[PDB]
Design a protein around this ligand. Sequence first.
Ligand SMILES: CCCCCCCCCCCCCCCCCC(=O)OC[C@H](COP(=O)([O-])OCC[N+](C)(C)C)OC(=O)CCCCCCCCCCCCCCCCC
Ligand code: SF4
Ligand code: SF4
Ligand code: SF4
Lengths: 176, 379, 70, 97, 156, 318, 115
Amino acid sequence: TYKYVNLREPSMDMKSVTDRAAQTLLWTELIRGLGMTLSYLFREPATINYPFEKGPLSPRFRGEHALRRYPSGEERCIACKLCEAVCPAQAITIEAEPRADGSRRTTRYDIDMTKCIYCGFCQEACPVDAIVEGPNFEFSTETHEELLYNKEKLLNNGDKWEAEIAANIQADYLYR
Amino acid sequence: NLTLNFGPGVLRLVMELSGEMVRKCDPHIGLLHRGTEKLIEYKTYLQALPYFDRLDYVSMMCNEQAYSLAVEKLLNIRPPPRAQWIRVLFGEITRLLNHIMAVTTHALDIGAMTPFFWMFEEREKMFEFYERVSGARMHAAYVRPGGVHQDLPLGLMDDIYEFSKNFSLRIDELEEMLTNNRIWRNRTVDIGIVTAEDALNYGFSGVMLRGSGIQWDLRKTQPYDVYDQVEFDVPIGSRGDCYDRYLCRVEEMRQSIRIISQCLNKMPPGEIKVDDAKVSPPKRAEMKTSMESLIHHFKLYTEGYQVPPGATYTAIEAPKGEFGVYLVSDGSSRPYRCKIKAPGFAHLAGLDKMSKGHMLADVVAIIGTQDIVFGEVDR
Amino acid sequence: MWFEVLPGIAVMGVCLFIPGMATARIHRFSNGGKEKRVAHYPYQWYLMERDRRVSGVNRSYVSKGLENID
Amino acid sequence: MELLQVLKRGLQQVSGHGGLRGYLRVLFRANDVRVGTLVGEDKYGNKYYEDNKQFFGRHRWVIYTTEMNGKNTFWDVDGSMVPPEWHRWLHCMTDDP
Amino acid sequence: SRGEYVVAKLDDLINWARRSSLWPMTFGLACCAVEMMHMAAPRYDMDRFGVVFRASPRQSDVMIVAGTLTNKMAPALRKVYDQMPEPRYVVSMGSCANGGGYYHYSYSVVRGCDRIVPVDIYVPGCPPTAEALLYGILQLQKKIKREKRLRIWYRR
Amino acid sequence: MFMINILMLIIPILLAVAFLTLVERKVLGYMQLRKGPNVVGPYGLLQPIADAIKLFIKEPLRPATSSASMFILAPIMALGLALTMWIPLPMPYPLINMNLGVLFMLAMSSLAVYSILWSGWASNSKYALIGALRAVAQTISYEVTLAIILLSVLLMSGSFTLSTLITTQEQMWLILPAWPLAMMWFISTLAETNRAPFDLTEGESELVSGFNVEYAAGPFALFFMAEYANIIMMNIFTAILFLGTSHNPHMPELYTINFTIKSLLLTMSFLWIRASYPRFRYDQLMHLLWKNFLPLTLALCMWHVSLPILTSGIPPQT
Amino acid sequence: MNLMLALLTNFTLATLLVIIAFWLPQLNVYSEKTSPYECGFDPMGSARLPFSMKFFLVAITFLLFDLEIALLLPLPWASQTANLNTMLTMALFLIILLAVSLAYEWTQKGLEWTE
Ligand SMILES: CCCCCCCCCCCCCCCCCC(=O)OC[C@H](COP(=O)([O-])OCC[N+](C)(C)C)OC(=O)CCCCCCCCCCCCCCCCC
Ligand code: SF4
Ligand code: SF4
Ligand code: SF4
């Protein structure tokens, strides 16, 4: 099924020809366009008062990265390198070795936040919910070096955003 | 004549002007060529998915859909019915996102600035639908070979209904500013006329064909997903100019609301990705309790699923025209070759023809009516 | 809201009002409290010059009435 | 009568901020003089307000503290000063403060 | 007085003027330009901070490099930067401009716009949300508020 | 005391221009569903001051291959003429009461076109010389209709004195007898000032640069002041011409309040129009002047020459 | 006198703002700067702008029309004469010839912009 957008024959009776002459001479349809912008002047603007107000987000938002812990304080990551294999941008670099107690843990865990495309595949791939993308989106830096995160930065983000990262995972894990 | 270098997406026009008239237009592209098609050869099929969000970065989920349809075809698997309805739902929301950008930035370029701000308060509300399903405002990567990543969050369909209940009024406000405006008509009527046969021979698609009366739309001639279970009308132009193509896009926005009103009422229950763990990853609650599910989660995210050897050309009716990928598989986890057919690549190549006998200020109108984004032209 | 545009308009309005008031009040201050004489044509200039010689002082805006004639 | 009630609401914002000084303070720090219901206050001094008659996006706001971790924030407020517990509520990721 | 007092207040005057009237020239190169257009859209309305929607290079104060910078485009981005009157600042928006991003290992991509021009603020994301970009601009205002051009001149 | 009078005119004009930039950004803001400047000072009131200081402490780039003499002359000519046109305006009392005030306004207005021409020459760009030629052809075309329209209205007033237009409208606004002329006068003052939808140079951004694209910092500010000083002056001229305010010699401030309100509304109508329409193609705004406005203006000049004679309503000469 | 003071004040103030607009700011010049803006790409030719005939005809058409307006300016004073019939005829003759001049350029494709 199709419809025509601009297939019309204007009427040629003197009533209609004089209407179009009035529009041409009296600028009637241009003034009608001024009435549409006059109405907006008297509406409430959609602007929010950032930074005192913030735009709404959801529990699924993908922001700054963070490495999480178990409730005991043990790191969740067991250096399986699934996030490093799936990362479409190759932004994750991992080195691991047995820990002093024999556990499988990382010695290097860097995310180049300038290669990362903030896609979330790393948290989908992770089998222990170690690497997540948190809700923070306000971490712009003054240098390129501050955006090459290492394991210490990522563990500091996790200890900094656990209160809010845990709540978001609680509100979305049933959809995963 | 006079040779000028216009430009600083970012484009470079090497134009030859005889006073006010354009004698030849010579677009220079590649200012945003990034080697997407070569990079995809080093990625798995899942890793290549975010690359398609970034080709036509105004119609993100339609690019994802075309790639998923191609991979699903080479896999020989079928997404479940609910996933297909979701893809059509967000395919039509994505059409609104693109047509607002196309119409309003087109108007902004020719001096009409106000409608851009009105309709970008509706895009900001449609970006909230993207963010609530995928977590990213623009590059969702939500549509994947096999279906969609996650199911809709509870209450999202009520908010899609509230939005679509008011969007018709916003289109009327847009039309009150442009459709019958004599200044807007003088900038678009009889500008960039393309004949039906030239449109086909030059490889045009979408409103470029339909603005010139050609009755073609892949959603109706070669349906995909569940587009054959929705009622909508295909707008058809008569003059073949910039103004007729402008009306086609504005009418297509109204037909998307018509389709969206049906995807909300006809949404079925069920799963949202193919129940085949050798293609789509298992649920996280079963990857942590079943040995088979853990092996398949491990392999799908490290090696990926192998696609049977073969080559397919799969196309969809993207908002900008026919978008398709020629995808070649060698039987491994990584595509051997992925040519991306961007509709704006053929349209831009026809700018030189469409600009014959027009003023320099009509080139801006012509580029706007082709709806060119250089992420997909350059790739 | 829209009435938050008025503070900028009021400042602009007051600025456009100062030139008109200043000229009105400066002329009266400089012409004995009356409007500055308008002399577009030589006849109007001739009388104004005559009023300058008749005032005793060298000022055309000082008026001499019947008390100056006997 | 409705136009007369507009000026009354504009006058009770001065009293709702604790006089002319409280009114001018929030006007120059936050460029906004709306009065909302106090939802809570965090350990750093940020005060969180809500007003559910405002359109979505403006129905929650934070008046930042004037001092945090030794930094004078009377003028130099920043969006990253919101602790995580309130960062979820202020961005409407939840309805529970 | 002390001399240092007059210079300190004059710095605040010119620092306040420069951060309250930031006129950006936006290099919309790829998707990140869309999120830059949503910061000009009504919800965030960057114009309300003194940041005009768009300005020509000769009257621009900050260059926002929003999108992938390819080798072909690299010479043209430097030319526009050289022609910006000083003081001039550069905000790198998104992964592609920050360090190359998704296309870091490409044969045709500049691995970070900081190879071509100095950068004052890096905004991370792919794309950064329109609010995360507005946070960068507001973070550039505070950087300009810390300038001590006259205090340093007074002590030369 | 006369030197005080001059300053009482110039300084407020430069302040009115400053806060017209604030109102333009807030009226356009609210007509676009947003707020506009409201952070720099209360309701943005300090924004013009920040923009002024910022511009004048920035590098004033002048290309090495630019004619310095003409690069400096153009802003001086533009602003100098912009302020000159304000001296004969009866608001209600002119600073300089001219017998030929109307003709003085036209004479100075036609000189301002040089600043556009000199600036284009001094650039040595050829991305701006074409812009200057396009801008100059637009401006001279539309001062043909301004002169003929203004001549037609003076045939109901009697003289070129600006104050006599107050007496003419002591019973009724000239917009009723001359609404056809007022319509074209309003559009002609939009095209003279290069205001949308006639801004093919200043901000077209359609493969066409502005004649002052090469200016930066203070020199750019001076061109901006001249352009905005003309927008207010043309709208003040329109108020006097077609919306005459009654003049009470005992309460002259009443005139200034009413006349100030009308001029503001007409000025805000310029801002209203910019937010509502796209922009004419360059060849279209020439066809508007030569094929539509000029034929109608000539006919209404014939009609307004013979109407007073055939109705026995010729105005007095003085 | 009053007029000369006004003009001197207006043009002296403009000159003052220009000098403080070139000396107050801190300058730093190099070859890459202080070049024509172009559009970010190098110039494609060391030749000046070609001469366009149409732009020359609008300037001449304005000039000839502007000269006929000079004759129409004294109409307000002309209507006060006792020979109104003669005055009215010559007023209309001038305007009609102005329209005939417009009609000639119109029909001879003098007002077009298509090469
Ligand atoms: C018995 C007494 C007899 C006395 C004489 C009777 C006279 C009868 C009426 C005369 C006709 C009316 C003439 C109106 C003017 C003609 C305008 C025209 O030419 O239109 C055609 C033109 C051209 O129209 P076009 O593009 O459709 O082309 C027409 C010609 N063809 C098709 C062949 C090419 O239209 C325009 O003027 C464009 C307008 C652009 C302006 C946009 C801004 C408008 C905003 C509204 C502002 C309102 C102004 C109010 C100012 C108030 C100030 C105080
Ligand atoms: S979000 Fe995507 S690109 Fe970024 S680290 Fe995770 S997998 Fe890699
Ligand atoms: S973060 Fe998760 S996926 Fe990555 S190495 Fe650690 S446990 Fe494995
Ligand atoms: S950083 Fe992301 S959004 Fe920005 S240009 Fe690169 S791929 Fe596009």
